[PDB]
Write a protein that binds this ligand. Structure first.
Ligand code: ADP
Ligand code: ADP
Ligand code: ADP
Ligand code: ADP
Lengths: 135, 442, 442, 443, 445
């Protein structure tokens, strides 16, 4: 999922576009007051009409817990494997973002191109500012 | 050229302001049913009503499915028509009520017309210019982007926004490429290099689209035909997102879900708003359910509920049962396997069996459709065999007779071929006779 | 929309003394049931008591769903009216009690009051600072009116709303703070020098004068089930449309109840109850009735209206017979409204109203014939014959349905009784209960 | 003004200090022996010593079985947990009925824990990261540390943040000038709002403005929490609340009920026993109420036989209104109240009795008092005679249409004509059955 | 190979002439002349391909040759034509409806034929040189590739350069690039460099260096069923559903679009339609819903020719409460033609046993063959067919290369048929668990 890129495919093939994929790709960058974009923006209009971005949280979980720890006494390989599985750099970089001054340092003062950056910013946004935490 | 039990029926064959004739449109006889279906076709073309149900009942091999396909042919290829069987509503992913509602929404069409302003052609130049007073701490402050386009019998240089240079660099548009610029959105997209830039490298993955015709700038008025279920399934799933959930759901199995009433209500109100604006218009269609006796009483009750909706199409049902127990019940004896609550909400069209000359005419029509030459005495023997055993048995035995005539190097079917086909292939009655006379587990 | 079965009913037709007029608001006859439904409507509009079960019973084609539609039309907007059938409870995704709980909680509305600030002005300067990957976005906005000039700070959602329907430094925009809605009213400056990519053909409006910022008070209605689905998980707003809300736990529901009571105490929100209508209630198991018997006793319970047409039939899920298909526990805590059959005058008035709704002009003799055939057969058959005779009427090119059109429509289409007569006469041609048929005619 | 629904005229069992029930107090009329037995059961629950005790409320329809359970729940108070169920709720399509029954068993055992939190809070003044040597080295994150400058009232601290904390910091989208709240127990960060030391009226994102937090940046506070054992079970079963990859992905997947093994329950019991032995926890057993117990089948009854013999299970209160009925899931056994005899042997049946005319009359009087209606004496006598003749519930539910019909005639009292008109407009079960018997086409 | 001697592997096509007249013994088929002529007629119907949606029914007593006839039709059909063979019990799935499973089985039996051209340049990479411009907008490449005979120099586009950064080459890997298509693949490492890096690794593989002409031309022909196109266009990466079966109720609109595009490709001339045969063995356990769906689905233009085999008498249709001939409803039997099969006599049984002994590499004497023929006359035929193969092992254990009458008698005494087991059960039924669960364990009363 993380490493997937929108590569090109040749035209002479049996995999063509469905009508639903055409409906999807029409409203990617379409502006407002167009019939197709407004016909495919039901959820955004329902979000704006219902004043949902200023609603409050009514539910909080009672107990929050980390995953169960597994220990093997007298072995360092299991600790490295557990630290690699729990704190995988690829997934944790996918669920976060790089700071802006760090991006400026690697793009300009280090010569790294934009396409060689790790994948960032795949965490889904919450409904409100209140819905981002349990405290 | 492929034929399968049909495709000799071309419309109902009615004259205008009148009734059916005898032999027209591949139909022989069945005059009252054809007139009733023509009245139903005119009602559908009137485009005013909602949720009218028609059940046509009769014996087997009478032409109910032929009548439904003739209705769908008479309506045209633009009005929606969803054929269905009663066994198809029992799915293991979602409840039967949701499948019935999905097939209800599949039969309502929409016609949307738009206008597109298009810049396209081969890129001739791409000069991102730089401003008179640049700001410190930055590089190449862009004031505008000048891009030259070249197409067939016309070229035109443009003067674009500085923001579109970011999308140009994103989509890797270089020289010699063909691009596609619409007016309001910006959003440059690239189709490929020209055919004139193909023979400078031996090996390249990239295809070479030819240079497009017409001028650089043009207006095309397009018309898009979608159904209400297409809008529901497009709004229900999210668009191309930038989260793990939408990418993960795109690569997994597309499991069906229970579409809520709220989404359909919002789709209905935005469709009504744009219908009032004068852009779109509504084309209701036909939902055809063959073998309606296979439904149980829960689907019948939900059909009673859904036939009173404001957006339901016309429903056409067909059945061959008599006084038969309704499925899902133990002691409800009802005509055609349909409960009386549903029967009270519909109209019944009666279909009648044929006689010998109509059987002969139908056999002759199916023979001349299949490009077969039949002798007259062979035709009479086939008609006598058909009226003795079955119409479908005489229709299905025509191809082995043609194969046996082709084996003996001739282009005509005579009495010996139909006798050999009678000897080789049996029917239901003779099979039942040889099963009842043998006790060897036959 | 289209013309439905109950499209001619706008309200219940009652005066200020809750006495039904004989012919008003599309409802004729049935004075006792209409008075009782008006009493139930006033009980709902009072909003004081909760958890009352009302049962509507009678023969088929009597006006039960018509009465429910009249109640829902007299209820008005902003009060939830959940209308479901009996077969919609059974799902492959939720349990029966969970679906019943969701159907119960969809009929309670919460009216939430919000304080917002409206900003309308002319855009002067836009500065947008984004990172290299385009993720972290911030900037400043300089907007003006004819009197004031203010610099605002922008977040991510504001920048996303600006970069869609792109504003170009001189457009007049309107921003709602609490809703986050950006509306481009038009362009006032009418700049000459423009890039040749976008249209920018917006209408010419004036620059607004006076105060830039205005406080306002807005209200909106949100159902309880919406709040449970939203607070259930991370992406509950998608689950409000996709219907993938699988078995919400009880802790969420009681915390939502506590928060709703807190909001009522603070004066922020008020509770608006509604009506849940369950048509064809006899298609429910005894476990659903056992759950309803306890769900009716809660404070957060709506007025439940049930309709049925069964006599003394078998309760589903058991092996005994009960009146209306309901056990005596549910019948003890419910109040029954009984509907009665019609005369010929009420049938004539109903047919005249339905002909006026469908824009069909009838002669007096055609109306008398339709009244007679609706006395003999059912009312729904004579209601359905009107549009068919109408299409026959323009098939002979006159816009008035005469007696011969009704006679031809009676000839082409059958009743329930005539089809039963034909099946009992020609039983050998239809498949019976044991799968026996005679296809051959010799 | 207030909402009333079939209850809420009942505030308790209404006993004195000796356990003797009054004839009419606490919203109850009659049923003296059942109320005294329920008071004994209430004292047994408040003793907090027993485990796996069960009683059964047997009686006819409309006699006060659910009313006694709600009176028990009101007499216990809100601190003692109380889980009301219907018998049809145990059949789920996501998990077997045995696991649902065990879940509802564990949902009725409360716990009160004094919890200590290490809290860093203040106003963000400096947010400065520093970079790694090779960001494209494949292993290790892009940054190495983040320097955060926090300012509270009468204090100021600087912190060098771990990157794993910084993921939760930047997921909250904090900035310079925001008041934050870092919980060191889990690493969770709450962004409170913009500081009020700067300007206010130059924002467009309807933010909330908050003063500086009092006291020092680093704090320790004690928090009293109320938590059931089922909450701990579902927290450990689906772990959300860490800062790891698995805990992050646990919040995004669709939740589903799973068969929680007994090993997790033994581990949770061991940890809770350690917390009790440390002196920071107190165990509050509760009541599980299963109304309409005849909807259960033989498999749930057979599992309930085992589940009542554990050492954790709370007091279970059942109810039924069947005389001699075959158990569901069987063919030919016949048992009282639809409850099999092996389960009946472990119960304590509390009998419930029907009412009289005077009790019906005073119940009608009190329910008319609660609904804020004025009833004449002759109309009250007619309503009591109707309640004896047809049903108590039918006379109960005819009060509000009578009030509506009185209000439409511009009156406050309820008179005999309104009762007669409500009789003529609204029917009961017996008259509807008599109409259905003399009907034409299955009316 | 990966094929052992199956139940009927001796049947290679129907034994017919050029005038559709069956020979008495040819191509492994003995007797059953009328059914063989009917199967030849059906085979010519399939090979003509202009008739769509026909249902035939092969009905007969058990151990007669209905499945043998279907195997003969499949063998005589040849390659590159789809022949689907499913049982009646396979469509009762847990993740798919019976209608969807039947639709997938219908669409697996009709395919399209696509022919394409390939210009393969297969060889070992010697050295790659990349030229970058000062602007960097384009990259030029000089590729030095070789076979065992000769080596040329090729110029490369930037898309080649980006395609060779992925699945990277290390000057000695064997690749093959197309000219017109430009498909890039990495076959593996050459055998000449196998003693270089001292440890292989994870993904690497050693292949021989290709020899001969560097640039080859090859025309290949593909046959794709419609179900594969449905599965491919249903998802984003659909071939995993093609190999794991996790399709899950593909919608109807994609099927309509695929049918329309197949008709468009046929009209243009890109592809041609190859029909096929669908064989449903043991059709008598299908539900009535599946029968109604078959009745409706047989009338479409994209329908194959359905062959159904059953051996039931007048038996109960499943899902109903009545009986019917062949276990099939009468409306399904109306739209069908029945090929009946007849039982054998002594001579055809002897010929079948001789052919089966020839196939299983077993030599029998004349007396042993006559004894097995008498046993197959009295008992069934499959009993004698198994008796041959166990008597061969008995004869080999007796250190003899031929099967005699004593070995056949020993195999007859050791292994029982149905009738002797029925008699032994009915004589000592107190020792067996009956339908009430009563059994006597102890031997002393
Ligand atoms: N009036 C007719 N004219 C020509 N062919 C007919 C007519 N009626 C029926 N047929 C033929 O009969 C065949 C089967 O009829 P069908 O519609 O299946 O009847 P049913 O649906 O009642 O079984 C069709 O192939 C059709 O071509
Ligand atoms: N008083 C009335 N006013 C308007 N329409 C009526 C009236 N009485 C009956 N109808 C018509 O008769 C039918 C009543 O059937 P339905 O609405 O299903 O309720 P029920 O099943 O209780 O009779 C409806 O189609 C309705 O249009
Ligand atoms: N002793 C009582 N005093 C006042 N109201 C009572 C009494 N007993 C029963 N009721 C009322 O009778 C109704 C039915 O009692 P409930 O226990 O809820 O149902 P059931 O008795 O059928 O289980 C309740 O609304 C309750 O308010
Ligand atoms: N005509 C035949 N020629 C050769 N072998 C045959 C013939 N008919 C049947 N057999 C053999 O008989 C065996 C069982 O026959 P089978 O086809 O399974 O019977 P059924 O069709 O009743 O299932 C098969 O192994 C097959 O090889």
């Amino acid at each position: 999922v993380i490493e997937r890129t929108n590569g090109p495919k040749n035209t002479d093939s049996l995999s063509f576009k469905t009508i639903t994929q055409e409906l999807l790709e029409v409203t990617r960058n379409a502006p407002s007051e167009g019939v197709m974009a407004s016909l495919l923006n039901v959820e955004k209009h329902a979000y704006e009409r219902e004043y949902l971005n200023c609603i409050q949280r009514g539910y909080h979980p009672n107990v929050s817990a980390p995953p169960v720890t597994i220990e093997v006494l007298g072995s360092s390989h299991v600790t490295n494997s557990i630290n690699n599985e729990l704190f995988d750099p690829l997934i944790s970089q996918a669920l976060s973002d790089i700071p802006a001054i760090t991006q400026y340092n690697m793009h300009v003062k280090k010569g790294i191109p934009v396409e060689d950056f790790p994948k960032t910013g795949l965490f889904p946004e919450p409904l409100n500012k209140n819905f981002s935490s349990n405290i | 050229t492929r034929t399968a039990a049909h495709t000799h029926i071309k419309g109902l064959g009615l004259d205008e302001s009148g009734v059916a004739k005898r032999v027209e449109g591949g139909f022989v006889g069945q005059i009252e049913a054809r007139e009733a279906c023509g009245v139903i076709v005119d009602l559908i073309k009137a485009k005013k009503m909602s949720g009218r149900a028609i059940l046509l009942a009769g014996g087997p091999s009478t032409g109910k499915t032929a009548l439904a396909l003739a209705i769908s042919q008479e309506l045209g290829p633009k009005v929606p028509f969803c054929p269905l069987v009663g066994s198809e509503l029992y799915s293991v992913e979602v409840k039967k009520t949701e499948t019935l509602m999905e097939n209800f929404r599949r039969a309502i069409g929409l016609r949307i017309k738009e206008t597109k302003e298009v810049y396209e052609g081969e890129v001739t130049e791409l000069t991102p210019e730089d401003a008179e007073n640049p700001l410190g701490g930055y590089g190449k402050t862009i004031s505008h982007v000048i891009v030259g386009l070249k197409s067939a019998k016309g070229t035109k240089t443009l003067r674009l926004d500085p923001t579109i240079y970011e999308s140009i660099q994103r989509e890797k548009v270089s020289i010699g490429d063909v691009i596609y610029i619409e007016a309001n959105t910006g959003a440059v997209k690239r189709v490929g290099r020209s055919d004139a830039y193909a023979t400078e490298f031996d090996l390249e993955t990239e295809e070479y689209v030819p240079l497009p015709k017409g001028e650089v700038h043009k207006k095309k008025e397009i018309v898009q035909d979608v159904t209400l279920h297409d809008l529901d399934v497009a709004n229900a799933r999210p668009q191309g997102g930038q989260d793990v959930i939408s990418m993960m759901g795109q690569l997994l199995k597309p499991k069906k879900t229970e579409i809520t009433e709220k989404l359909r209500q919002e789709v209905n109100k935005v469709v009504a708003k744009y219908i009032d604006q004068g852009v779109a218009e509504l084309i209701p269609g036909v939902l055809f359910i063959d073998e309606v006796n296979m439904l149980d009483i829960e689907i019948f009750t939900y059909l009673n509920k859904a036939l009173e909706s404001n957006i339901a199409p016309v429903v056409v049902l067909a059945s061959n049962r008599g006084m038969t127990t309704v499925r899902g019940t133990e002691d409800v004896i009802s005509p055609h396997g349909v409960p009386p609550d549903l029967i009270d909400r519909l109209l019944i069209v009666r279909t009648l069996p044929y006689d010998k000359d109509e059987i002969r005419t139908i056999i002759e029509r199916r023979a001349t459709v299949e490009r077969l030459q039949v002798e007259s005495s062979a035709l009479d023997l086939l008609a006598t065999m058909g009226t003795e055993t079955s119409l479908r048995y005489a229709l299905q035995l025509l191809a082995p007779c043609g194969i046996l005539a082709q084996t003996s190097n001739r282009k005509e079917i005579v009495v010996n071929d139909v006798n050999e086909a009678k000897l080789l292939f049996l029917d239901a009655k003779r099979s039942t006779k040889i099963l009842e006379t043998s006790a060897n587990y036959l | 929309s289209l013309i439905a079965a109950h499209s001619h009913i706008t309200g219940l037709g009652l005066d200020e003394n809750l006495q039904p007029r004989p012919t008003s608001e599309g409802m004729v006859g049935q004075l006792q049931a209409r008075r009782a439904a008006g009493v139930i409507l006033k009980m709902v509009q009072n909003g004081t008591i909760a958890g009352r079960a009302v049962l509507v019973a009678g023969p088929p084609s009597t006006g039960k769903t018509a009465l429910a539609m009249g109640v829902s039309q007299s209820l008005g907007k902003d009060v939830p009216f959940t209308a479901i059938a009996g077969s919609e409870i059974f799902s492959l995704e939720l349990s029966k009690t969970e679906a019943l709980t969701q159907a119960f909680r969809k009929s309670i509305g919460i009216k939430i009051k919000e304080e917002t600030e409206l900003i309308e002005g002319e855009v002067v300067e836009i500065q947008i600072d984004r990172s290299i990957t385009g993720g972290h976005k911030q900037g400043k906005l300089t907007i003006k009116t004819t009197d004031m000039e203010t610099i605002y700070e922008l977040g991510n959602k504001m920048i996303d709303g600006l970069t869609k329907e792109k504003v170009l430094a001189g457009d007049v925009i309107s921003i709602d703070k609490a809703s986050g809605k950006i509306t481009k009213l038009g362009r006032s400056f009418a700049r000459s020098r423009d890039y040749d990519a976008m249209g920018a053909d917006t209408r010419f409006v004036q620059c607004p004068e006076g105060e830039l910022q205005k406080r306002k008070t807005v209200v909106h209605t949100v159902s309880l089930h919406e709040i449970d689905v939203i607070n259930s998980r991370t992406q509950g707003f998608l689950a409000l449309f996709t219907g993938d809300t699988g078995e919400i736990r009880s802790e969420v529901r009681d915390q939502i109840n506590t928060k709703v009571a807190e909001w009522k105490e603070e004066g922020k929100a008020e509770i608006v109850p509604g009506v849940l209508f369950i048509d064809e209630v006899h298609m429910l198991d005894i476990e659903c009735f056992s759950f309803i018997n306890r769900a009716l006793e809660d404070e957060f319970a709506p007025i439940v209206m049930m309709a049925t047409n069964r006599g003394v039939s078998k309760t589903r899920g058991t092996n005994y017979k009960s009146p209306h298909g309901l056990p005596l526990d549910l019948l003890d805590r419910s109040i029954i409204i009984t509907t009665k059959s019609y005369n010929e005058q009420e049938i004539k008035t109903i047919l005249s109203i339905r002909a006026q709704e469908e824009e069909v002009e009838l002669s007096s003799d055609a109306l008398d014939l339709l009244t007679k055939t609706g006395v003999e057969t059912s009312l729904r058959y004579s209601s359905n014959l009107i549009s068919v005779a109408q299409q026959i009427a323009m098939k002979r090119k006159n816009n008035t349905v005469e007696v011969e059109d009704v006679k031809r429509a009676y000839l082409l289409f059958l009743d329930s009784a005539r089809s039963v007569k034909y099946v009992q006469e020609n039983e050998s041609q239809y498949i019976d209960d044991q799968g026996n048929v005679q296809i051959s005619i010799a």
